[PDB]
Write a protein that binds this ligand. Structure first.
Ligand SMILES: [Mg+2]
Ligand SMILES: [Mg+2]
Ligand SMILES: [Mg+2]
Ligand SMILES: [Mg+2]
Ligand SMILES: [Mg+2]
Ligand SMILES: [Mg+2]
Ligand SMILES: [Mg+2]
Ligand SMILES: [Mg+2]
Ligand SMILES: [Mg+2]
Ligand SMILES: [Mg+2]
Ligand SMILES: [Zn+2]
Lengths: 107, 100, 62, 106, 50, 131
RNA sequence: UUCAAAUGAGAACUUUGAAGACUGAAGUGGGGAAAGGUUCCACGUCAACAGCAGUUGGACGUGGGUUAGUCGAUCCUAAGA
RNA sequence: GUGAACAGCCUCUAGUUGAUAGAAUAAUGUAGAUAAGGGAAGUCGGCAAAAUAGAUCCGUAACUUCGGGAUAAGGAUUGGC
């Protein structure tokens, strides 16, 4: 099924205690696992703008909270091992605090 | 809105490591132009007319090369060593036939 | 495709380092066709290859 | 000494495409041009006028084309047109507003 | 060295012209026992020693 | 916690407190006893050249003059300008012994204040004359 | 170190773009002397080698490339032979 | 740029981003740190660490081949506007 939602991921408690050279790569992997949990799709693709948002303050300056837009869509290629995949985009907001999960109407 | 503009500018800019690409050298799309001008709230009639004129001017007409060679390729046997027509092939010039 | 040769040729033609040369990722086949500095110059002219500006070292604080 | 200098800006292309307001642009220039480090000090020194397609600035007090381009780029950024409209020089002290390159959608 | 003698350059030219694998038509000859170039030289394996 | 704070403000490396220095500066008799001392080998400068505000002994008169013509002494004097901050201040801040604190405040404002200021002025002019 | 696309049967390691860093002009930059000898560059290309991998390579196959009255040798003499 | 400075640190031009990787965070290690009160009671032996450190000002003994010792020793200061 095709669906789009906006989430907030708490990267602070997921990166708590991580070595400074590994913080941003582990943030990438935590976002992939987060999307896999919320959409049931092992295929998760992150937008390069989301990668920029993760890496904006260096390798050890990841944000505590990130506002993500996750779209479960259809894998249109006929060689796909899974029929659906997740696409994760950044949501550049005034503040990531106090935001609940919402459903975006795909129009 | 001002806070959102600050956040978007911070995400876009990377000035400490490299410069921003020049807009005079880049090109953009009329779909993005129309959506931005619609967000600003102008009238898109003149811009849409200019885009329609440009699109109707940019015409593709099938030529004889499209008719004959459009779905084909090659026309010449590919050499084993990637050589030109008059380039010697030290390894294989003594063996004329491909079976041998 | 392998555009290492085209990146080197574009740097040499434009007169900057390879760090200041931008190859359009959408015109990959067009860039791959360019084996010569003349074709590289044509690509620079039509905007497939772009020279980037220098990174700023401002002297305001100094 | 105080030889008057004339700077022209051609706003015809954005105005005819209906994304620009020459009167607002000229009023912005009048309100934001600085003389001896302060705005609102254009007494018989800087005059800005517009006739719908050309904005003319006549100045006898330290006005450059670089300053005019700086102010015009500030105005375009304020109107969120900086990503689409640029300020260029056709000849010396004669300028125009152009659009950046846009490929048709088809 | 870039500024080399003609004698050195001549030996280098001979080495370059010797540097090749076997011609393939040699393998097709009757009673051929030559199956590879046993005296092949590479610049990073065996030095020419001047 | 850190090494600088620990090795400076260790318990055995303590200096005289602001309220004690205020009580030393309050009266002229205390000023006289601190200025005129017997020669003691265990103190630097034989117990002479003693800055009361900084509660510190210098080795020589020129050293005391240089110390007085410096920002450290000025910082100490500005710190001592105010209320000496006894425990009554904290009790009153919590709302405890408020009348006692008000009585101490008015006594400081009336009696002990100007007399301490006059003693400071006389000490300063004595140091200027003798140095 | 990371993201996307491309290529490919196959991509942590190839290419382009998007990012984060580093050498910091006594350089991880630009040239030379000794030495090496084609390693330079292009096209093809993966069995072996590159202590993982590999579509990449200083690897394998086939070719192209070094233009002087003025830069050097050549001439002079040094310790010496 | 800081700074006495081709020092250390940060940056521009140019050049790299190479060295098998992933997941956890037991003991013992290697490299680096902090620590109440005491202050060499440790040890063959203060080994190792710690403490000192730039600059300005005050001041500086025995001895001496009269040149030194000497930055002797011992004190005071340092920001911003
Ligand atoms: Mg930890
Ligand atoms: Mg650095
Ligand atoms: Mg060279
Ligand atoms: Mg090569
Ligand atoms: Mg291997
Ligand atoms: Mg080869
Ligand atoms: Mg201790
Ligand atoms: Mg003992
Ligand atoms: Mg013992
Ligand atoms: Mg001594
Ligand atoms: Zn004092």
């Amino acid at each position: 099924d095709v669906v789009t939602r906006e989430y907030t991921i708490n990267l602070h408690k997921r990166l708590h205690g991580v070595s400074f050279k590994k913080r941003a790569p582990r943030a990438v992997k935590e976002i992939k696992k987060f999307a896999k949990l919320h959409m049931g799709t092992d295929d998760v693709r992150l937008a390069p703008e989301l990668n920029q948002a993760i890496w904006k303050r260096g390798v050890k300056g990841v944000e505590y909270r990130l506002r993500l837009r996750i779209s479960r869509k259809r894998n249109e290629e006929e060689d796909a091992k899974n029929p659906l995949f997740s696409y994760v985009e950044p949501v550049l907001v005034a503040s990531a605090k106090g935001l609940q999960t919402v459903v975006v109407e795909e129009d | 809105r001002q806070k959102t503009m600050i956040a978007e500018a911070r995400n876009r800019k990377s000035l400490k490591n490299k410069a921003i690409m020049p807009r005079s050298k880049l090109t953009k799309s009329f779909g993005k132009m129309e959506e931005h001008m619609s967000t600003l709230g102008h009238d898109m009639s003149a811009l849409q007319d200019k885009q329609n004129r440009a699109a109707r001017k940019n015409r593709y007409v099938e030529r004889g090369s499209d008719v004959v060679f459009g779905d084909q390729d090659a026309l010449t046997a590919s050499t084993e060593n990637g050589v030109k027509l008059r380039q010697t092939d030290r390894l294989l010039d003594g063996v004329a036939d491909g079976s041998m | 495709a392998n555009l290492r040769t085209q990146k080197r040729l574009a740097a040499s033609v434009v007169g900057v380092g390879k760090r200041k040369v931008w190859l359009d990722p959408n015109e990959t086949s067009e860039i791959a066709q360019a084996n010569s500095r003349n074709a590289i110059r044509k690509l620079v002219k039509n905007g497939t290859i772009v020279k980037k500006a220098v990174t700023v070292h401002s002297k305001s604080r100094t | 000494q105080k030889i008057a200098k004339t700077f022209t800006v051609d706003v015809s292309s954005p105005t005819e495409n209906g994304v620009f307001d020459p009167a607002s642009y000229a009023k912005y220039l009048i309100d934001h041009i600085k003389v001896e480090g302060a705005v609102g000090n254009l007494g018989n020194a800087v005059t800005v006028t517009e006739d719908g397609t050309v904005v003319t600035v006549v100045s006898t007090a330290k006005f450059s084309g670089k300053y005019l381009k700086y102010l015009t780029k500030k105005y375009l950024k304020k109107n969120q047109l900086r990503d689409w409209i640029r300020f260029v020089s056709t000849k010396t002290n004669e300028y125009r507003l152009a659009f950046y390159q846009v490929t048709p959608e088809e | 060295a870039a500024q080399k003698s003609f004698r050195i350059k001549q030996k280098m030219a001979k080495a370059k012209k010797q540097n090749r694998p076997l011609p393939q038509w040699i393998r097709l000859r009757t009673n051929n026992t030559i199956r590879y170039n046993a005296k092949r030289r590479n610049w990073r394996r065996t030095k020419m020693n001047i | 916690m850190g090494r600088y704070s620990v090795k400076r403000y260790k318990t055995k490396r303590r200096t005289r407190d602001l309220d004690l220095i205020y009580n030393d500066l309050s009266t002229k008799e205390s000023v006289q006893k601190l200025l005129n001392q017997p020669l003691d080998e265990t103190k630097p400068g034989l117990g002479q050249h003693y800055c009361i505000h900084c509660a510190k002994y210098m080795e020589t008169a020129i050293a005391l003059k240089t110390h007085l013509k410096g920002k450290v002494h000025k910082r100490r004097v500005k710190e001592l300008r105010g209320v000496p901050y006894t425990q009554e201040v904290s009790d009153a801040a919590a709302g405890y012994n408020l009348n006692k604190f008000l009585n101490r405040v008015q006594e400081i404002t009336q009696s002990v204040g100007p007399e301490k200021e006059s003693n400071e002025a006389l000490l300063k002019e004595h140091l200027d004359s003798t140095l």
